Design a protein around this motif. Structure first.
Motif, PDB file in Angstrom:
ATOM      1  N   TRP G  20      33.391  67.190 -13.041  1.00 58.63           N
ATOM      2  CA  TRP G  20      33.834  68.305 -13.933  1.00 58.63           C
ATOM      3  C   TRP G  20      33.768  68.107 -15.372  1.00 58.63           C
ATOM      4  O   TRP G  20      33.392  69.150 -16.281  1.00 58.63           O
ATOM      5  CB  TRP G  20      35.262  68.698 -13.640  1.00 58.63           C
ATOM      6  CG  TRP G  20      35.503  69.208 -12.225  1.00 58.63           C
ATOM      7  CD1 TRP G  20      34.952  68.621 -11.217  1.00 58.63           C
ATOM      8  CD2 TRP G  20      36.252  70.483 -11.832  1.00 58.63           C
ATOM      9  NE1 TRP G  20      35.424  69.489  -9.959  1.00 58.63           N
ATOM     10  CE2 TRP G  20      36.149  70.359 -10.497  1.00 58.63           C
ATOM     11  CE3 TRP G  20      36.969  71.355 -12.582  1.00 58.63           C
ATOM     12  CZ2 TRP G  20      36.976  71.402  -9.812  1.00 58.63           C
ATOM     13  CZ3 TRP G  20      37.897  72.090 -11.833  1.00 58.63           C
ATOM     14  CH2 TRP G  20      37.733  72.480 -10.579  1.00 58.63           C
ATOM     15  N   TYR G 172      31.818  70.864   2.645  1.00 50.68           N
ATOM     16  CA  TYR G 172      31.102  70.427   1.583  1.00 50.68           C
ATOM     17  C   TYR G 172      31.595  68.884   1.375  1.00 50.68           C
ATOM     18  O   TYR G 172      30.620  68.076   0.775  1.00 50.68           O
ATOM     19  CB  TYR G 172      30.828  71.127   0.217  1.00 50.68           C
ATOM     20  CG  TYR G 172      29.802  70.575  -0.511  1.00 50.68           C
ATOM     21  CD1 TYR G 172      28.287  71.386  -0.242  1.00 50.68           C
ATOM     22  CD2 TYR G 172      30.006  69.892  -1.707  1.00 50.68           C
ATOM     23  CE1 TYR G 172      27.432  71.012  -1.072  1.00 50.68           C
ATOM     24  CE2 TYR G 172      28.898  69.492  -2.380  1.00 50.68           C
ATOM     25  CZ  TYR G 172      27.722  70.095  -2.159  1.00 50.68           C
ATOM     26  OH  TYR G 172      26.470  69.653  -2.935  1.00 50.68           O
ATOM     27  N   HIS G 173      32.806  68.608   1.414  1.00 49.07           N
ATOM     28  CA  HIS G 173      33.215  67.216   1.374  1.00 49.07           C
ATOM     29  C   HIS G 173      33.702  66.552   2.353  1.00 49.07           C
ATOM     30  O   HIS G 173      33.946  65.150   2.389  1.00 49.07           O
ATOM     31  CB  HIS G 173      34.347  67.284   0.044  1.00 49.07           C
ATOM     32  CG  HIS G 173      33.895  67.840  -1.151  1.00 49.07           C
ATOM     33  ND1 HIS G 173      33.756  67.086  -2.416  1.00 49.07           N
ATOM     34  CD2 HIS G 173      33.366  69.147  -1.432  1.00 49.07           C
ATOM     35  CE1 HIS G 173      33.354  68.131  -3.303  1.00 49.07           C
ATOM     36  NE2 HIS G 173      33.228  69.374  -2.683  1.00 49.07           N
TER      37      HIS G 173
HETATM   38  C1  CLA Z   1      39.969  70.918  -6.362  1.00 47.95           C
HETATM   39  C2  CLA Z   1      39.132  70.835  -5.264  1.00 47.95           C
HETATM   40  C3  CLA Z   1      37.748  70.471  -5.521  1.00 47.95           C
HETATM   41  C4  CLA Z   1      37.011  69.540  -6.310  1.00 47.95           C
HETATM   42  C5  CLA Z   1      37.799  68.363  -7.043  1.00 47.95           C
HETATM   43  C6  CLA Z   1      35.806  69.658  -6.135  1.00 47.95           C
HETATM   44  C7  CLA Z   1      34.686  68.648  -6.875  1.00 47.95           C
HETATM   45  C8  CLA Z   1      33.227  68.758  -6.928  1.00 47.95           C
HETATM   46  N1  CLA Z   1      32.783  69.862  -6.516  1.00 47.95           N
HETATM   47 MG1  CLA Z   1      33.601  71.194  -5.019  1.00 47.95          MG
HETATM   48  N2  CLA Z   1      34.275  72.873  -3.855  1.00 47.95           N
HETATM   49  C9  CLA Z   1      35.647  73.174  -3.508  1.00 47.95           C
HETATM   50  C10 CLA Z   1      36.522  72.361  -4.373  1.00 47.95           C
HETATM   51  C11 CLA Z   1      36.462  71.266  -4.994  1.00 47.95           C
HETATM   52  N3  CLA Z   1      35.397  70.541  -5.647  1.00 47.95           N
HETATM   53  C12 CLA Z   1      35.740  74.580  -3.034  1.00 47.95           C
HETATM   54  C13 CLA Z   1      37.203  74.946  -2.661  1.00 47.95           C
HETATM   55  C14 CLA Z   1      34.690  74.973  -2.525  1.00 47.95           C
HETATM   56  C15 CLA Z   1      34.178  76.093  -1.825  1.00 47.95           C
HETATM   57  C16 CLA Z   1      33.785  77.212  -3.032  1.00 47.95           C
HETATM   58  C17 CLA Z   1      33.507  73.814  -3.144  1.00 47.95           C
HETATM   59  C18 CLA Z   1      32.078  73.771  -2.923  1.00 47.95           C
HETATM   60  C19 CLA Z   1      31.378  72.826  -3.572  1.00 47.95           C
HETATM   61  C20 CLA Z   1      29.652  73.178  -3.749  1.00 47.95           C
HETATM   62  C21 CLA Z   1      28.828  74.167  -3.002  1.00 47.95           C
HETATM   63  C22 CLA Z   1      29.325  72.310  -4.577  1.00 47.95           C
HETATM   64  C23 CLA Z   1      30.593  71.569  -4.973  1.00 47.95           C
HETATM   65  C24 CLA Z   1      30.282  70.601  -6.005  1.00 47.95           C
HETATM   66  C25 CLA Z   1      31.436  69.529  -6.688  1.00 47.95           C
HETATM   67  C26 CLA Z   1      31.152  68.383  -7.454  1.00 47.95           C
HETATM   68  C27 CLA Z   1      30.475  68.782  -8.909  1.00 47.95           C
HETATM   69  C28 CLA Z   1      30.519  70.355  -9.302  1.00 47.95           C
HETATM   70  C29 CLA Z   1      32.010  70.711  -9.990  1.00 47.95           C
HETATM   71  O1  CLA Z   1      32.946  70.338  -9.535  1.00 47.95           O
HETATM   72  O2  CLA Z   1      31.763  71.428 -11.278  1.00 47.95           O
HETATM   73  C30 CLA Z   1      32.713  72.443 -11.412  1.00 47.95           C
HETATM   74  C31 CLA Z   1      32.564  73.895 -11.462  1.00 47.95           C
HETATM   75  C32 CLA Z   1      33.558  74.598 -11.572  1.00 47.95           C
HETATM   76  C33 CLA Z   1      34.654  74.399 -11.814  1.00 47.95           C
HETATM   77  C34 CLA Z   1      33.293  76.247 -11.419  1.00 47.95           C
HETATM   78  C35 CLA Z   1      33.845  76.904 -10.170  1.00 47.95           C
HETATM   79  C36 CLA Z   1      34.274  78.373 -10.286  1.00 47.95           C
HETATM   80  C37 CLA Z   1      34.905  78.850  -8.939  1.00 47.95           C
HETATM   81  C38 CLA Z   1      34.494  78.188  -7.778  1.00 47.95           C
HETATM   82  C39 CLA Z   1      34.982  80.475  -9.095  1.00 47.95           C
HETATM   83  C40 CLA Z   1      34.947  81.403 -10.034  1.00 47.95           C
HETATM   84  C41 CLA Z   1      35.174  82.893  -9.815  1.00 47.95           C
HETATM   85  C42 CLA Z   1      35.203  83.795 -10.949  1.00 47.95           C
HETATM   86  C43 CLA Z   1      34.004  83.802 -11.538  1.00 47.95           C
HETATM   87  C44 CLA Z   1      36.139  83.703 -11.812  1.00 47.95           C
HETATM   88  C45 CLA Z   1      36.557  84.714 -12.863  1.00 47.95           C
HETATM   89  C46 CLA Z   1      36.227  84.404 -14.218  1.00 47.95           C
HETATM   90  C47 CLA Z   1      35.991  85.754 -15.202  1.00 47.95           C
HETATM   91  C48 CLA Z   1      34.671  86.307 -14.727  1.00 47.95           C
HETATM   92  C49 CLA Z   1      36.996  86.655 -14.987  1.00 47.95           C
HETATM   93  C50 CLA Z   1      32.501  67.827  -7.592  1.00 47.95           C
HETATM   94  C51 CLA Z   1      32.609  66.447  -7.347  1.00 47.95           C
HETATM   95  C52 CLA Z   1      28.708  70.646  -6.017  1.00 47.95           C
HETATM   96  C53 CLA Z   1      28.059  69.165  -6.127  1.00 47.95           C
HETATM   97  O3  CLA Z   1      26.885  69.146  -6.577  1.00 47.95           O
HETATM   98  O4  CLA Z   1      28.621  68.315  -5.485  1.00 47.95           O
HETATM   99  C54 CLA Z   1      27.922  66.844  -5.998  1.00 47.95           C
HETATM  100  C55 CLA Z   1      28.063  71.602  -5.228  1.00 47.95           C
HETATM  101  O5  CLA Z   1      27.134  71.920  -4.982  1.00 47.95           O
HETATM  102  N4  CLA Z   1      31.650  72.282  -4.718  1.00 47.95           N
END
Ligand code: CLA
Ligand code: CLA
Ligand code: CLA
Ligand code: CLA
Ligand code: CLA
Ligand code: CLA
Ligand code: CLA
Ligand SMILES: CCCCCCCCCCCCCCCC(=O)OC[C@H](COP(=O)(O)OC[C@@H](O)CO)OC(=O)CCCCCCCCCCCCCCC
Ligand SMILES: CC1=C(/C=C/C(C)=C/C=C/C(C)=C/C=C/C=C(C)/C=C/C=C(C)/C=C/C2=C(C)C[C@H](O)CC2(C)C)C(C)(C)C[C@H](O)C1
Ligand SMILES: CC1=C(/C=C/C(C)=C/C=CC(/C)=C/C=C/C=C(C)/C=C/C=C(C)/C=C/C2=C(C)CCCC2(C)C)C(C)(C)CCC1
Ligand SMILES: CC1=C(C/C=C(\C)CCC[C@H](C)CCC[C@H](C)CCCC(C)C)C(=O)c2ccccc2C1=O
Ligand code: SF4
Ligand code: SF4
Lengths: 80, 73, 73, 61, 138, 73, 743, 155
Positions: G20, G172-173
């Protein structure tokens, strides 16, 4: 009939020749760089002005400059 | 009248900004130091160096024409 | 139109039209003396600027004359 | 002007004009532009280094 | 050269050379292969290159060069020759023009279009006004 | 009609004056013969002029549009 | 035979915040540091492009399954929000008591800067913003009578969102399926046809039969919402259902004995709208859901999955072959199983078309009760679904071009329909361009000709009912056939599907619900204008998709990529030559077409359908028959529609609708700001940024991240985004203010 | 001509008009029920606002006009808010400039610019409460203005 001119700052990296899509450039022996080669434009009649070579040049300021001048059938890229 | 006169000022300043910038940067710029070698009106220098659309001074005039129409409007 | 769409979509479109004209019977006899080509980049900017300018001036001319006439006539 | 020597650019068309840069290496083959200079800033092409001549650079301190 | 050389198996397409190519320049590409590979024609489509000798006609030099680029990249085919045919019938050897790739330095090539020093030394347009001289000209 | 007529023509005229000035810089200006001249000095600190014009235009726009929209809201 | 089995990888990706703190980690180029301000934009531009990150299809498939779960969770949170707003800050019970007099509203604005005026006197005690989303009508049709049910539904939605969050993270994890999974298109289709849609419609039909039907029947019988028995009582005590519907006395025995005709009390086919609420008969709707569920369930057993019985999509595709199509649909199966972009293009086009069809069918046959009488809701829903459908269609074209540029393969597409099309793409595009020119002339020229005639005082030479007439004889004929269908081609149907085709008018609460929409010369011209605009936008998209790989101007567009600025100022100019630019232009054309479509619906509805009815049947529309002679000229479209109807949005200041007026102005600003990015180039902005950077350097306040102008492609994207946002917001505020102030 | 709003009939007329507009909607509701209290608070706020604005100057339209000529009698109208704005924005600018100057001393200033260093950022934000004094001494020492910067052809 675009005019392609090579300047002395050329490092002979050949990227301009490699990125040219009309075989307008080539590499010729030279002694102005360790590469011992310099870019040349002996077929400027086939140039269209896409400037792919200008984009592929690594020197600070492009060592190869393409000036858009007379327009012909080859330069307009017309297949009709 | 005060507010619209200030708007009139905004328009006059922005139009002269575009035109003055076009005249002063007509010979060269950090993006295209050899602009003077390509004349006053030319399309561009290709997508190299990030992109050079509307680099020529003629385009500065063409961009200032819209602002003049707005200011005079 | 010309201020948004740039040369390249029109060049291909004209190529398609050229193919259509030289591949249709009873109309192949008529051959263009000058090869059709899309408006140049700078030519497009000038044509679009002229259209925009003509529209701006004519629209406000009609509005001002008609309003000042009907209001006091 | 030698290995890692701070030098100010003098080329007008150079993107790093009036800026200081380090000397990566100096040619000894009698070339037109034998001083390779690297800068902290990048130009519009995403490249940070370029070749220059002795007359186009001035040593700093 | 070798106008009777076999052609790749193509099913037509509406992007080939038009009448203009008949009354004007028409480029040709002749290359040899050992496997019946399938390549994307520069005019839009898919063709099978006959095992042995392949000859095709195009309306632009860039199209032939692009086809050669894909034949050299998608496949390890480097013996591609691009010729130019005029309405009179005289052929002209265009690519590589010397048997060596342009980006590969080769002896016998004379520098063309060379300007002394960097572009910063170009004269101002005012100094070459009303004359048949350009800024890049020294 | 007359006021708008002359004002629109005035806008076109000043924009043309600036365009011709840019053309003069590219085609009819040789810095070799204009050394330490008022015109040459203008070209020497062109960046400062453009920056200040930009600041004035930005200040006027931000404040005039802010006041207009505040009153509107 | 292939085993349709599930294989997953455990602990494939670790759960940590380490990645992150490294923006751009998903890209090799973006992980080396910004070095310029363009990196910030590139970080978001390539964030959801999973195909550019890695070259493995398995990883992309996993990144899609997840994030699909995230979007599902986002949708569930939004739904929970709507339900909670209805339960806590809405006059839903009051609306139920007096649906025609009370204006729906579920938003309460805080009193801080004088914005408290936006709390309109919608009635029912509370004062707030009138909602035109149809949430109240939908909830009433679902049987909701008390706010406790709305609260429970909101809580359930929040729980479902949490589940869709956990599922997304778990897939995914904790358990990521392999590429063999996701490639089982037969199983996925069977389940989505029989389980997601078939069983879904079956369950909804059951809910309607046991909850919607009885509750709505009692509501339409003059029973107070508080006195109606709870939904569970109708299931536990069968006596109540028997009293309301005698068919329940027989129970499920008739179903198992094939005596389905005994269900004529609950499974009716009346065909028309209810005269009490103005919407479709809930019994016909329940019977419709039951039939669609049974049909979808039967359709879900077509493909072969883990058993001998079924069908193979590849075999069916390869079987279809003809003389005019050499290899037919050979190779398409591999295309739709190895490229998510192709599937996304097909699905986006179909979803957009489905949304447009939904809009038409929802306005013509109001499904929810009191939906027709609430003109604000009708206008907002038709316009909303029309816009979402158009956006999804343009996206479909964009993804088709993406697949063509990146996932295309000559070997796979050999002598098939796709290859054969790419071969003659010039015939397709030139003939389509000819059709577009003909349509534009014969559609807009008619309008221009009418303007010229009316201005010259030569009204006898116009294309109108009085002058030269252009009657949609084919459409009028279809309307007459529909009017006579309930007795000659629909024996069991008791009334026409939609009263818009003919029959009689329906009035609810002294307001017109649905009356025959007569078509005339104005409708002929406007429909042709719609066809013309649709043809031009499809031409732009098809041209971009067919020439995405190469063209006579650029022989190797594919190597340049799908989203590239240009090839340079060569060959006369190659600006906006990439397929992405074709999508960029198609967006404006789709916006123009959709704007004209929504304009026609709004004006026609307000001049010939929506209105009031005085005692004895006298009808008075919002704009009495002005569309017949005013919609045939551009001047009429500017005077009787854009100028006359805008008075409500410009005079809204000082009232609860003032906000709309403000949004009406703001939108304009945005629409005018987009011009900045559409009529300009990044070379000029880069020079201006150079001067500003020099000013910063003079004060030792320059930033480490070298300021750069927006990319050429990014500039085009910003311009189109602002243009669409401003235009759609302007027409949104205009439509909402006009429909709320009057009618 | 301009006259105090407290002595202008247009101001009182506008106040009465607004009160009437609120009362018209207030009459529909009931004394003690949701709403009706919401409109009473608005009426009280209107009274307070007009009593507050009575000290300002307004013409025939009755709208308060603000004098920006710099007259001490009207300092509260523009002078005081102008000075307070300049102080707030000078503080913003000075803290930003100092943070940039510190980041440029790190190994990778770009990373600091993207991922802000909350500790040092807050260290420079908390300070600078005397930015007018810090602007000076930086200028006197010559650490504010630069000497040579990036310039293109034809300086
Ligand atoms: C707290 C739990 C958690 C944690 C620690 C992680 C951690 C990680 N995830 Mg993951 N994931 C999670 C939950 C979690 N995830 C959930 C619940 C989902 C289902 C959606 C996913 C699905 C997912 C996928 C498909 C992928 C990862 C990936 C990854 C890795 C890199 C990307 C990243 O985190 O950047 C941080 C990015 C963000 C914080 C942005 C996320 C935005 C959220 C989801 C939605 C926003 C909605 C909306 C626009 C908000 C309104 C804003 C405004 C317009 C008003 C990282 C180690 C990527 C990877 O490459 O793994 C190596 C990968 O492709 N995750
Ligand atoms: C997925 C959709 C769905 C779902 C979840 C349900 C769910 C339910 N339905 Mg239902 N229903 C649906 C769709 C659905 N329905 C559809 C599409 C129809 C056709 C329009 C019906 C029509 C229907 C009727 C008419 C009834 C239900 C009833 C019920 C409830 C009990 C069913 C039962 O086992 O009683 C079983 C009843 C039987 C008669 C069993 C048949 C065989 C018996 C054993 C005969 C042997 C004789 C024996 C002595 C019993 C005498 C019974 C006689 C007096 C009727 C149940 C909660 C029942 C209910 O509880 O009413 C509230 C009810 O009567 N449904
Ligand atoms: C599809 C709807 C549509 C569209 C696309 C247009 C488009 C246009 N209209 Mg138009 N109009 C429409 C509907 C539409 N109109 C309708 C329904 C009516 C009522 C019948 C009108 C009545 C109308 C009139 C009377 C006029 C136009 C004019 C124009 C042209 C303005 C040229 C320009 O560049 O803007 C320039 C934009 C502005 C000058 C701003 C416009 C309005 C603001 C509120 C004025 C604010 C002035 C303020 C002092 C400026 C400083 C503020 C700033 C500092 C914050 C333009 C072609 C004008 C024209 O002739 O062109 C000059 C003209 O006078 N229209
Ligand atoms: C509505 C149309 C519009 C608007 C508003 C502008 C505005 C501006 N133009 Mg411009 N322009 C336009 C059309 C427009 N242009 C067109 C059609 C052309 C022809 C191509 C040009 C070509 C042009 C050129 C060539 C130049 C400008 C320049 C400028 C800037 C002048 C300085 C200034 O006043 O800054 C003040 C800022 C504003 C007026 C914008 C208002 C402030 C915003 C709304 C606040 C920030 C967003 C806010 C928080 C809300 C969003 C929140 C978010 C969550 C969504 C200014 C931002 C000049 C420039 O760069 O100046 C230095 C410049 O040289 N324009
Ligand atoms: C009858 C079984 C079934 C059902 C009901 C569904 C339903 C759904 N699938 Mg799915 N699928 C299935 C079997 C099923 N699938 C099988 C066997 C495969 C492998 C061949 C796939 C592979 C698959 C993929 C690759 C994707 C989906 C997606 C989706 C969702 C589409 C989005 C939507 O329309 O929103 C509608 C949403 C709802 C109506 C809410 C209902 C949600 C509940 C939980 C029902 C789903 C039950 C689930 C399939 C199984 C439970 C597992 C258990 C261990 C908990 C939807 C919920 C897409 C998606 O959105 O990803 C998440 C997608 O990417 N499916
Ligand atoms: C189910 C629908 C769907 C899905 C799943 C995708 C998925 C994808 N699209 Mg696609 N697309 C869609 C619909 C969809 N699209 C539609 C409807 C359109 C027409 C508008 C497009 C047009 C489109 C183009 C032209 C491109 C993609 C691209 C992509 C890929 C990368 C997206 C990205 O990283 O950009 C990041 C996303 C953003 C930075 C957000 C941009 C925000 C915009 C302006 C929307 C603002 C909306 C909001 C309501 C504004 C008001 C609020 C405001 C005041 C704050 C990705 C696989 C790109 C691609 O393939 O890569 C080469 C590509 O170039 N899409
Ligand atoms: C360290 C922050 C900082 C500082 C000290 C300055 C200072 C200055 N700017 Mg500048 N600017 C900044 C950020 C900053 N800017 C950013 C982020 C942008 C991009 C939007 C710009 C864009 C900009 C333009 C286009 C221009 C200036 C100009 C100027 C000069 C005249 C005043 C002015 O017009 O400001 C204008 C300020 C803005 C337009 C917006 C400022 C953005 C935010 C609100 C403030 C920065 C907050 C920053 C993130 C705080 C960091 C805190 C740290 C402790 C973590 C002045 C020396 C003018 C000039 O050229 O000199 C004559 C000019 O035309 N600036
Ligand atoms: C002529 C009777 C049909 C009335 C016209 C409207 C039909 C609607 C279907 C659209 C396609 C047109 C039907 C001929 C098309 C048709 O079905 O031909 C028959 C042929 C399909 O037969 P095959 O032997 O190829 O079958 C094998 C495969 O289809 C395997 O499924 O299609 C083609 O190969 C040519 C495709 C388009 C040929 C160019 C025509 C383009 C014109 C489009 C405009 C149509 C008229 C507009 C309305 C006035
Ligand atoms: C096929 C066959 C038969 C029977 C087949 C059967 C019994 C099929 C049964 C299907 C059923 C019972 C499906 C149930 C579906 C869904 C239910 C019960 C609940 C759905 C979700 C709800 C109600 C909530 C929705 C939300 C709302 C409305 C908005 C969101 O913000 C929040 C949220 C709370 C998630 C017979 C003939 C009997 C014999 C048997 O052997 C084979
Ligand atoms: C009597 C009196 C007075 C006086 C005043 C004065 C004395 C002042 C002024 C004035 C002025 C003073 C004005 C002006 C104007 C100007 C302008 C308008 C301009 C311009 C320019 C341009 C447009 C351009 C230029 C150029 C270029 C572009 C480049 C090259 C060079 C040149 C130069 C050509 C008053 C009224 C106060 C009051 C009463 C008394
Ligand atoms: C205006 C314009 C620009 C200039 C526009 C720019 C530089 C917009 C980007 C500026 C950003 C949004 C401001 C910086 C935001 C920072 C993150 C600062 C935030 C500070 C606080 C407010 C949080 C172009 O570069 C361009 C390029 C190609 C075609 C048209 C145009 C075009 O029209
Ligand atoms: S402009 Fe294009 S065709 Fe001409 S030399 Fe450069 S790369 Fe080759
Ligand atoms: S995209 Fe812009 S810079 Fe590139 S060729 Fe076209 S106009 Fe010139």
């Amino acid at each position: 009939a675009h005019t392609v001119k090579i300047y002395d700052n050329c490092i002979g990296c050949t990227q301009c020749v490699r990125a040219c899509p009309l075989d307008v450039l080539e590499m010729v022996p030279w002694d102005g760089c360790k590469a011992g080669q310099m870019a040349s434009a002996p077929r400027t009649e086939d140039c269209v002005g896409c400037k792919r070579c200008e984009t592929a040049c690594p020197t600070d300021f492009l060592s190869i400059r393409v000036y858009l001048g007379g327009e012909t059938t080859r330069s307009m890229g017309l297949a009709y | 009248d005060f507010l619209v006169h200030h708007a009139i000022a905004l328009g006059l300043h922005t139009t002269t900004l575009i035109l003055v910038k076009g005249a002063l940067d007509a010979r060269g710029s950090k993006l295209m130091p050899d602009k003077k070698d390509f004349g006053y009106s030319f399309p561009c220098d290709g997508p190299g160096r990030g992109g050079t659309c509307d680099i020529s001074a003629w385009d500065a005039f063409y961009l200032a024409m819209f602002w003049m129409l707005n200011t005079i409007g | 139109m010309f201020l948004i769409s740039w040369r390249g979509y029109w060049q291909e479109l004209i190529e398609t039209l050229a193919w259509a004209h030289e591949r249709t019977p009873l109309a192949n006899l008529i051959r263009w003396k000058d090869k059709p080509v899309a408006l140049s980049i700078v030519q497009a900017r000038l044509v679009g600027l002229v259209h925009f300018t003509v529209g701006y001036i004519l629209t406000y001319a009609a509005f001002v004359i008609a309003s000042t006439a009907g209001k006091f006539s | 002007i030698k290995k890692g020597s701070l030098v100010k650019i003098l080329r007008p068309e150079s993107f790093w004009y009036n800026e200081v840069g380090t000397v990566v290496n100096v040619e000894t083959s009698k070339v037109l532009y034998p001083v390779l200079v690297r800068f902290d800033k990048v130009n519009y092409s995403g490249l940070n280094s370029t070749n220059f001549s002795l007359d186009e650079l001035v040593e700093i301190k | 050269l070798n106008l009777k050389m076999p052609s790749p198996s193509f099913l037509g397409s509406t992007g080939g050379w038009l009448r203009c190519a008949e009354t004007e320049e028409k480029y040709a590409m002749t290359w040899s292969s050992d496997q019946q590979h399938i390549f994307e024609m520069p005019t839009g489509g898919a063709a099978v290159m006959n095992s042995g000798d392949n000859l095709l006609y195009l309306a632009r030099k860039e199209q032939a060069l692009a086809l050669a680029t894909q034949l050299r990249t998608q496949f390890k085919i480097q013996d591609y020759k691009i010729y130019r045919i005029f309405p009179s019938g005289e052929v002209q050897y265009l690519h590589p023009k010397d048997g060596v790739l342009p980006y590969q330095v080769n002896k016998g090539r004379e520098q063309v279009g060379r300007v002394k020093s960097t572009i910063g030394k170009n004269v101002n347009p005012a100094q070459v006004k009303f004359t048949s001289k350009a800024t890049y000209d020294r | 009609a007359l006021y708008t007529h002359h004002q629109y023509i005035a806008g076109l005229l000043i924009v043309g004056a600036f365009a011709h000035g840019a053309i003069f810089f590219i085609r009819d200006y040789d810095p070799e013969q204009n050394q330490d001249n008022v015109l040459a000095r203008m070209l020497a600190h062109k960046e400062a002029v453009i920056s200040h014009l930009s600041w004035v235009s930005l200040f006027l726009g931000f404040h005039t549009l802010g006041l207009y929209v505040h009153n509107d809201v | 035979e292939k085993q349709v089995k599930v294989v997953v990888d455990r602990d494939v990706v670790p759960t940590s915040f380490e990645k992150w703190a490294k923006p751009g980690h998903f890209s090799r180029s973006l992980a080396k540091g910004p070095k310029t301000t363009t990196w910030i934009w590139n970080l978001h531009a390539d964030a959801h492009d999973f195909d550019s990150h890695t070259s493995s299809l398995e990883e992309v498939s996993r990144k899609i399954f997840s994030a699909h779960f995230g979007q599902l969770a986002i949708i569930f949170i939004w739904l929970s929000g709507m339900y909670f707003h209805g339960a806590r800050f809405s006059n839903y019970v009051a609306w139920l008591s007096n649906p025609t007099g009370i204006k729906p509203s579920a938003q309460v604005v805080w009193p801080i800067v004088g914005q408290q005026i936006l709390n309109a006197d919608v009635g029912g005690g509370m004062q707030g913003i009138q909602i035109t989303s149809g949430l109240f009508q939908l909830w009433r049709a679902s049987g909701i009578v008390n706010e406790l049910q709305l609260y429970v539904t909101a809580l359930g939605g929040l729980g479902m969102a949490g589940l869709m969050i956990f599922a997304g993270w778990f897939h995914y994890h904790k358990a990521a399926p392999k590429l063999e999974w996701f490639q089982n298109v037969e199983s996925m289709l069977n389940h989505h046809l029989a389980g997601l849609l078939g069983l879904g419609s079956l369950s909804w039909a059951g809910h309607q039969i046991h909850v919607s039907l009885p509750i709505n029947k009692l509501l339409d019988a003059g029973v107070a919402p508080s006195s109606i028995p709870l939904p569970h009582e109708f299931i536990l005590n069968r006596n109540l259902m028997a009293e309301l519907y005698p068919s329940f006395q027989q129970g499920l025995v008739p179903f198992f004995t094939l005596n389905w005709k005994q269900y004529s009390d609950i499974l009716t086919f009346k065909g028309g709208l209810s005269p009490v609420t103005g919407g479709l008969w809930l019994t016909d709707v329940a019977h419709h859901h039951l039939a669609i569920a049974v049909l979808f369930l039967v359709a879900g057993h077509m493909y072969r999955t883990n058993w001998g019985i079924g069908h193979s999509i590849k075999q069916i595709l390869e079987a279809h072959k003809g003389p005019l199509t050499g290899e037919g649909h050979k190779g398409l199966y591999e295309i739709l199983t190895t490229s998510w972009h192709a599937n996304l293009a097909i699905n986006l086009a179909m979803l957009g078309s489905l949304s447009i069809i939904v809009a038409h069918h929802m306005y013509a046959m109001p499904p929810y009760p009191y939906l027709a009488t609430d003109y604000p809701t009708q206008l907002s829903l038709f316009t909303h679904h029309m816009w979402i459908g158009g956006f999804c269609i343009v996206g479909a074209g964009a993804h088709a071009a993406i697949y063509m540029v990146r996932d295309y393969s000559p070997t796979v597409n050999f002598n098939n329909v796709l290859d054969r099309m790419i071969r003659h793409r010039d015939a397709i595009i030139s003939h389509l361009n000819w059709v577009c020119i003909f349509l534009g002339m014969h559609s807009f020229g008619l309008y221009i000709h009418n303007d010229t005639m009316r201005a010259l005082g030569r009204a006898q030479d116009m294309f109108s009912d009085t002058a030269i007439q252009l009657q949609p004889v084919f459409a009028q004929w279809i309307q007459q056939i529909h009017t006579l269908a309930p007795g000659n081609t629909a024996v069991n149907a008791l009334a026409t599907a939609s009263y818009a085709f003919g029959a009689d008018t329906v009035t609810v609460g002294s307001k017109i619900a649905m009356m025959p929409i007569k078509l005339g010369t104005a409708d002929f011209m406007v429909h042709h204008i719609h066809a013309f605009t649709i043809h031009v936008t499809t031409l732009i998209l098809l041209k971009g998709v067919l020439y995405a790989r190469n063209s006579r101007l650029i022989p190797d567009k594919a190597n340049l990529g799908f989203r590239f600025p240009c090839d340079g100022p060569g060959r006369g100019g190659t600006c906006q030559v990439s397929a992405w630019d074709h999508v960029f232009l198609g967006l404006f054309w789709m916006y123009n077409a959709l704007s004209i479509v929504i304009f026609h619906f709004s004006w026609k509805m307000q001049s010939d359908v929506w209105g009031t009815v005085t005692s004895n049947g006298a009808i008075s529309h919002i704009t009495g028959g002005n569309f017949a002679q005013s919609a045939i000229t551009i001047n009429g479209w500017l005077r009787d529609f854009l100028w006359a109807q805008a008075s409500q949005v410009i005079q809204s200041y000082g009232s609860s609708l003032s906000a709309y007026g403000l949004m009406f102005l703001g939108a304009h600003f945005v629409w005018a700001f987009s011009l900045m990015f559409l009529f300009s180039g990044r070379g000029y902005w880069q020079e201006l940024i150079e001067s500003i950077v020099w000013a910063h350097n003079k004060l030792k306040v320059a930033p480490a991240i070298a300021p750069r102008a927006l990319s050429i492609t990014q500039g085009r994207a910003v311009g189109v985004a602002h243009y669409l946002l401003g235009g759609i917001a302007t027409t949104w505020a205009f439509f909402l203010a006009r429909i709320i102030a009057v009618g | 001509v301009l006259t105090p709003c407290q002595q202008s009939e247009a101001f009182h007329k506008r106040e009465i008009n607004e009160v009437r507009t609120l009362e018209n909607r207030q009459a529909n509701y009931e004394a003690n029920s949701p709403s009706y209290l919401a409109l009473q608070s608005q009426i009280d706020q209107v009274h307070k606002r007009f009593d507050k604005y009575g000290t300002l100057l307004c013409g025939q339209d009755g709208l308060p006009h603000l004098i920006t000529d710099g007259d001490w009698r009207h300092a509260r109208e523009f002078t005081i808010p102008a000075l307070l704005f300049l102080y707030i924005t000078g503080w913003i600018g000075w803290v930003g400039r100092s943070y940039l100057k510190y980041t440029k001393e790190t190994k990778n200033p770009t990373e600091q610019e993207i991922i802000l260093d909350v500790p040092m950022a807050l260290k420079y934000m908390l300070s600078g409460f005397l930015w007018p004094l810090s602007a000076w001494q930086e200028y006197r020492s010559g650490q504010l203005l630069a000497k040579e910067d990036e310039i293109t052809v034809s300086p």
